[PDB]
Ligand binder design. Structure first.
Ligand code: NI
Length: 314
């Protein structure tokens, strides 16, 4: 039951993977970091989970799909599937955690859905503000002529989010923890604490910040990745014997929306001013006049949706 074929040559996918202080071919305790839209690996995790996971005993690794995750999401997924295949064997055929933010969570779940070979190679998934259903703040699909391919695909009602949904991709495939906020200014809707939210996965550990820390708790898109509450939740997921964050680990002791306590003062300042969410506004990306066609492995699950070739059919 082979994997679908990569549209990209494997050497191009290998050029996006980097382990801090080790080689991806031979590494002990790796963790895969998948960045958000408009960012590279370092731009997303420089001030937070690259130094934080290193203190927890992991070798930080990450992918940086070019250019800044603005290309087709299904191509960004190839970088991740190649990265886990590499890191899993690189640690001697041992599962590894994967930690994501924004489109990274949608990339992680796309790869787990359509590339079965990696499903038993990810130990657990820890996703901060993932947009599995996309976002409504991306505008209507009929006013994005020229916008980046991934911006088309993360627009609510896209063929990509439709196919992921109908393929069974809104169910956790490996042990997953999703930490998100109702006050996410990038990903909406996030207010229901229910399967209506873009970050919700069926059977996962879905942690909406306001459900733990109260409705008046305010935490933005970037804060969802760097807050002390995010660190304590993220650390519970990684150390858990269930592979999901445990409600007994974190609690209301931890409801602090500022950069993680174990960060340095320099790394706390950089995390409190992280503009990566809005970095894309200045970066030049690809041009796209219609939603990118779905790869043949996902086309059946979005029948009736409109992409560049026309209305998808069986
Ligand atoms: Ni983002």
């Amino acid at each position: 039951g082979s994997d679908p074929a990569f549209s990209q040559p494997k050497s191009v996918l290998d050029a996006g993977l980097t382990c801090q202080g080790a080689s991806p071919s031979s590494v002990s305790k790796p963790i895969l970091l998948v960045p958000g839209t408009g960012t590279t690996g370092p731009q997303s995790f420089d001030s937070n989970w690259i130094p934080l996971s290193a203190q927890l005993g992991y070798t930080p690794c990450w992918i940086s799909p070019p250019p800044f995750m603005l290309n087709d999401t299904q191509v960004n997924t190839e970088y991740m599937v190649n990265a886990i295949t590499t890191l899993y064997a690189g640690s001697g055929n041992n599962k590894l955690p994967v930690l994501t933010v924004c489109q990274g969570g949608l990339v992680a779940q796309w790869g787990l859905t359509f590339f079965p070979s990696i499903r038993s190679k990810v130990d657990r998934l820890m996703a901060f503000a993932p947009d599995y259903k996309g976002t409504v703040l991306a505008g209507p699909l009929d006013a994005l002529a020229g916008s980046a391919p991934s911006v088309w695909q993360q627009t609510t009602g896209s063929a990509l989010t439709t196919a992921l949904r109908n393929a069974g991709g809104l169910t956790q495939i490996v042990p997953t923890t999703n930490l998100y906020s109702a006050t996410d200014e990038i990903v909406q809707p996030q207010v229901s604490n229910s399967p209506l939210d873009s970050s919700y996965l069926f059977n996962g550990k879905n942690v909406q910040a306001q459900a733990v820390c109260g409705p008046l708790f305010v935490i933005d898109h970037a804060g969802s990745l760097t807050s002390q509450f995010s660190y304590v939740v993220g650390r519970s997921a990684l150390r858990s014997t269930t592979g999901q964050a445990r409600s007994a680990d974190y609690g209301i002791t931890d409801c602090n929306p500022l950069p993680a306590n174990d960060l340095t003062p320099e790394q706390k300042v950089a995390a409190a001013a992280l503009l990566a969410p809005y970095y894309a506004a200045i970066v030049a990306g690809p041009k796209q006049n219609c939603e990118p066609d779905l790869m043949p492995y996902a086309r059946p699950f979005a029948v009736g949706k409109r992409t560049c070739s026309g209305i998808v059919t069986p």
